[PDB]
Amino acid sequence: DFNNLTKGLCTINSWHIYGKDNAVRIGEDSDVLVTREPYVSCDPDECRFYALSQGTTIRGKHSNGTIHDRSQYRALISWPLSSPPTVYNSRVECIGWSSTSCHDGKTRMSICISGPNNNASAVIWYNRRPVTEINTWARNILRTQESECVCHNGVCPVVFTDGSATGPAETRIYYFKEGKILKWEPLAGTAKHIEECSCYGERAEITCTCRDNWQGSNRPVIRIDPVAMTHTSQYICSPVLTDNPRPNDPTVGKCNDPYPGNNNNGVKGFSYLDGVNTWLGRTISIASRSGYEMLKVPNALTDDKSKPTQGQTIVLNTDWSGYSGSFMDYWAEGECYRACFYVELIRGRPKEDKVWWTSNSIVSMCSSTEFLGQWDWPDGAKIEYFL
Amino acid sequence: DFNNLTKGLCTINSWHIYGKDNAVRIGEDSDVLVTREPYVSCDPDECRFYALSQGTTIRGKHSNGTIHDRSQYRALISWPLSSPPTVYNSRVECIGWSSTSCHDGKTRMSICISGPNNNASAVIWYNRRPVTEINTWARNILRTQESECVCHNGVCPVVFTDGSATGPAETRIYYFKEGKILKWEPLAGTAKHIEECSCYGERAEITCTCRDNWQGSNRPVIRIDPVAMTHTSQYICSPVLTDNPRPNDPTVGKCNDPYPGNNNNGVKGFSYLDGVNTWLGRTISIASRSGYEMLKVPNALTDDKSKPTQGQTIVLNTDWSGYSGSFMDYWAEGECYRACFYVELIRGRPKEDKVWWTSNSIVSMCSSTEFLGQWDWPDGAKIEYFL
Amino acid sequence: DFNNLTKGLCTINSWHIYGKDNAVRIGEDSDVLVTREPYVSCDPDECRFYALSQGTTIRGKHSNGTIHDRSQYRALISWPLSSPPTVYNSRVECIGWSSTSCHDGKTRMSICISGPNNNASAVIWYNRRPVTEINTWARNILRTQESECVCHNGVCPVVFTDGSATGPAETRIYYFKEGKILKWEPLAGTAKHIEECSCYGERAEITCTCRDNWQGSNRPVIRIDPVAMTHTSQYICSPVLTDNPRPNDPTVGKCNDPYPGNNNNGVKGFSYLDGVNTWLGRTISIASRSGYEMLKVPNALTDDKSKPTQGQTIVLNTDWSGYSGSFMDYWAEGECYRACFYVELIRGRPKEDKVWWTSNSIVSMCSSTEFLGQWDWPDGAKIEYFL
Amino acid sequence: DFNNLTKGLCTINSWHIYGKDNAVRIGEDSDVLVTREPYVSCDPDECRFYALSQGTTIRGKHSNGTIHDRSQYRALISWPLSSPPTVYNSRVECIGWSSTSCHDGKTRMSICISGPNNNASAVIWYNRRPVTEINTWARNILRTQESECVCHNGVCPVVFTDGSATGPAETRIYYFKEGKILKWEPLAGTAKHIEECSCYGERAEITCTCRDNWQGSNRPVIRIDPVAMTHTSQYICSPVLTDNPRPNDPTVGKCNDPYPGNNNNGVKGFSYLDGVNTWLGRTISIASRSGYEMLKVPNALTDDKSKPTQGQTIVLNTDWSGYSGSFMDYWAEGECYRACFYVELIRGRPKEDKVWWTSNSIVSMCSSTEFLGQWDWPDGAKIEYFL
């Protein structure tokens, strides 16, 4: 029966290693698929890894050029947790160069987007059959979250942007129930630009932390009520800035406008915004997608003077990172929702020229009420072995 | 319980990408099987891809010569949708160099044909056991559809041709129920030659669009009543000609004879013939198996002056195509049968001499009542990487 | 519930291709396992292929020397029908250099034998757990059938030989029920030597056709009653001789002694002995394991003057063959037991020196009451591609 | 429902080959994973193999350096019995460089440990979800058994050591029920150092035989009562010494102190201590991890003058061995628990310098009340083929 967001978040007093696939290490001598934009998403019975295939293996010739985002040869695949995404084990969800996928308790909705830049469309699959289709409304790269959505009693909202990336676009919040559109609504609130939303839910409410590609170095937040099918947006108030590139941390930050400093750029990220129990991930570097850290900044959302009270490094500054996103196993046993997250560890081009490809690995963590010690989690491939 | 063709076709206002496997791209660096004559066919619970193996991998030595149609080393395999047909994941349906396979609601019938040219025979498997066998009646390459049949309340008819390909042959329409022959009947109507029939059903009626190899550039149609176990044949009236090679589109076409122009040749194709809601696929080229397009030609079947009112390009003229065929997921949720189809994208010999093999990829589409934008769907392998 | 041999054999008016794996063709460019002594055996729900692994892939270095029968690195594996026996898909039944395996309706018994030549022992697995063990009684290569046994209402007898191969040995017929020994009895009748028994059952009776390695060129037959747990042996009377090497067909043959001519040698074979409905497989060559043919010799068992009344070539004389054996899908739908059989197609050493290995492929057939045309079924690998 | 240790051990009158994977042989030409610290562990329905991945294939470049125990790229994997641990077939249990895993009748608990040496922590997974976490208490390489634990009516105790390896450490016995900690207690008894405990249970009692790394050449034993959740420790009295390196067998040995001779070293081992029905495995060499033998030494535990009355060689002195451990299929049919065990056959570095890696194979045996003949079970790879 349909899942219902009835619990709240657990106390995050630290994070533990949940998954890790070592795909590029293993990809050096096995038939692993060139991927990017990963995520993790849970069924009632298993959790799996998800990414967009580039339709080729790493050591295969046709990997030269996989730095490009959109093509006819990409697809959404999922595979068993902590396994490299291989040719013989992956399952294709749908054919597309942007995606999101979530399970509603009853079965799973997966949405892939394809097309030329000016004539793209999305197909909503539900129970591995195509159900519903939607065309560009603004005719400029229709795109979605690049991580799992969240349902509540049958209703799974999904954020789409169609339009410019260096200026105003058109963002809709669609509400689906059984693959069918119930309703949609234009973006609202005070966020000036939305891209790559990273979402979760507890106590009958959904929270996405997205990406202002055009103006903000602080991240905008969409908060959705899946029952009333309404939403609102805002930015994160705290001055611990968390996009990338980003200027240095000020002592005061914006609640309702972009923080200026970098233009027309960023990276996918997430946050868990739960009062004093609020954490933020970011690249350590303000210039590259390098390093990854979590920071506990009580009332980040609303207290525009907040600064960290505790922290944890996931990946060292000398290691490469990339996208990151939220997920939770809503079907886990127990009293509260244990928060999880993933970082994409991109290897290859641009930052590593000697090779002609671009892939990534994954590392996944979930929280602990314990105060566990920390390690760091590099991709661990040796690029010279690919030369 | 046995499936029953009780719905009608949905409104096709465009086509969306359904599947795609990138096998030859991926085949460059994985253990993928050299195949041809693909198709797609649905079970109650999953849809899969189907093709005849050449009993060898692409990069394997024994791929030299896979331009030949019939041998002891071919087989019907199926695999998970949008996966390349690999050595470690394919399932063998039966041993044969021609085939068809369909599910009757209760379980699946798969028919492979083998033998020398003058002493071939077919074995009807049902529930993965062999049940019934049939010998050449005309002792000249017994052959079937090369795509899924259609049942209705237990009764799955299948079209076979035995005889010449450049002249008169003998075509029987067999009716099976549980793998057993109920009845068969010689071809009737006004079609002069039948090969490679592409079939579907709605509202208790079955429609195959086949191939006059010897005379016609317009395609003959067999229409079957699975309840009365009778059939009839005809040609498509419209002058938008759809075999290949074919002469140029006239302004008037034959309802009951072949349109002349090319002799002793053609390609497998399909159509959906549903009044004003009628669509036709064809190669864009009139000379090569190149490009693929869909065209909406209201009353193609019967109105011998009809010309397109809307269209969609699946594969550009500069890309290679090949066979194409119909399928529908009869077990999908909803009110009408959503029409689907596939194009085989042949690579290698003849048209690509530098290599000694012949394989293919797949792209599959299904309809949408939406008016979606279009992309094009090349195989996307780079043949020079195989040199 | 336990299976019961209640039907009789169907009319074999010809044989159809049932399975074929092309393993050595495919083995040239995939991770397939070096095997030998194959067979096919059925569960209630699927039929699979079975062979002894040499613990190495064909293209792998450790394939040099796989001409040897017994070692610590062999195992019984099974895999999905008509798939090459690959490293990633095979299942290990047990660890041993001789075997047999059968399903009793309830679950499956698999028996592997290992050890040094003078201290070997057998372990009876049942439901994938080890249950019962048996030591050499004559301390000279304890060995079993190399193909599936047959049960009836829970009771599966198995023939073992312990002793010399060029002279008298000690052969026991063990009766198992649920992996446990019910009883065993020394060989009886007039057969002078028993090896590699090939068995089937209908109408509550079991028939094995085995191998006199030391004296006979005509094949001895053990007939078992699984209910009374008694047996008897005999030779086949007909002069269509069917071991190999063998002298030429006489006009009269032995019912109760070996036919002389070749000493201390032979090959695994089978027959179906059902009155006028009696068929015999053999190598076409009297010198090599080459070619394979079926011959219909009414009352072969008992009429010592019988000669063929119809025939079918499975493999041409110019192609290599090897072991062969009986199986039937006792759980198939229908009124009679449809007879099946397999031929091992050995490649490599001895007869093909240029390579350092010895493997094989499979071809499987089952009967048809039809009179189907015939093809021939070579392994189809090109040994030069391995050089 | 929860499993309950209600039977006793069967009579071990010898040991039979149970499993064997030939991974390094097969690893020479397939995508097998570099592993070590294997074990075998049973579910209600299947038994599988288990080891820590080094996150790389043997023939892959990133195998250079896999002599190191702890890193970010290790994981616990399991795979189907007697299959090589391959990239496409393994399942990841959890991310860690030390482990144990057991099934409680209802579902399976798997515990992996990761971290830097001075800030490691353990996560207890249960039903493939993370449940409970535990941090270093002594801040010096927190480590567990490296083989399966044992439950009884829901309660699975596990031994952990945190501290020095060449001196006093801190060892806790934790009691889990459903992944949750019920209780834990410091080590007690007269054992001076505990590492790598190898455990089993019958008649409602649990017996681990562990490793005094710092002082003893005789092995300490922890005996646990899972109902009263108490334990005690002791050493094995017999003078048939069974760690490695070890001095030569004295004529009298310690019941309550270490036997002196080698310092700060050893290897994982096991014993079955059941009165006159007591067996001990060890390396044949007293200097290297070479050879493996079983010895029947009645009342080893308690009779400090005991010497072997019967024996069996598993691996010859000229072959390499390594860790070894106990398991039993508690869900097997029958009256008593049949004892099983495994030996890790390490290949590569240190003892084999020509290669830059370190992997292993497995051989598994279980007992027989029979008196079966013996063979020996080398890994069987040829290291020169890797040069």
Ligand SMILES: CC(=O)N[C@H]1[C@H]([C@H](O)[C@H](O)CO)OC(C(=O)O)=C[C@@H]1O
């Ligand atoms: C639909 C698509 O191509 N999106 C791409 C997205 C886009 O370029 C940015 O969102 C500005 O609009 O970002 C990136 C990138 O690594 O930054 C890759 C994505 O796949």
Ligand SMILES: CC(=O)N[C@H]1[C@H]([C@H](O)[C@H](O)CO)OC(C(=O)O)=C[C@@H]1O
């Ligand atoms: C049984 C068989 O070999 N049929 C072949 C079929 C045949 O040559 C044509 O139908 C004329 O009879 O067409 C082709 C081809 O690509 O055109 C390949 C098919 O496998």
Ligand SMILES: CC(=O)N[C@H]1[C@H]([C@H](O)[C@H](O)CO)OC(C(=O)O)=C[C@@H]1O
């Ligand atoms: C146990 C064993 O090794 N048997 C072998 C068997 C034996 O050599 C013959 O039966 C004479 O005794 O025959 C052959 C062979 O291809 O002829 C290989 C078998 O595996």
Ligand SMILES: CC(=O)N[C@H]1[C@H]([C@H](O)[C@H](O)CO)OC(C(=O)O)=C[C@@H]1O
């Ligand atoms: C946690 C860890 O690294 N343990 C290692 C363990 C340790 O070095 C010894 O127990 C002394 O403390 O032994 C060995 C070894 O082959 O001997 C490898 C283990 O993985």
Ligand SMILES: [Ca+2]
């Ligand atoms: Ca930005």
Ligand SMILES: [Ca+2]
């Ligand atoms: Ca034509």
Ligand SMILES: [Ca+2]
């Ligand atoms: Ca003989």
Ligand SMILES: [Ca+2]
């Ligand atoms: Ca020691």
